[PDB]
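Amino acid chain
________________
===
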Amino acid sequence: MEELQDDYEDMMEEN
């Protein structure tokens, strides 16, 4: 559904 933790907005990448 919308099971997010970050401010992603269609691109799920973290550094």
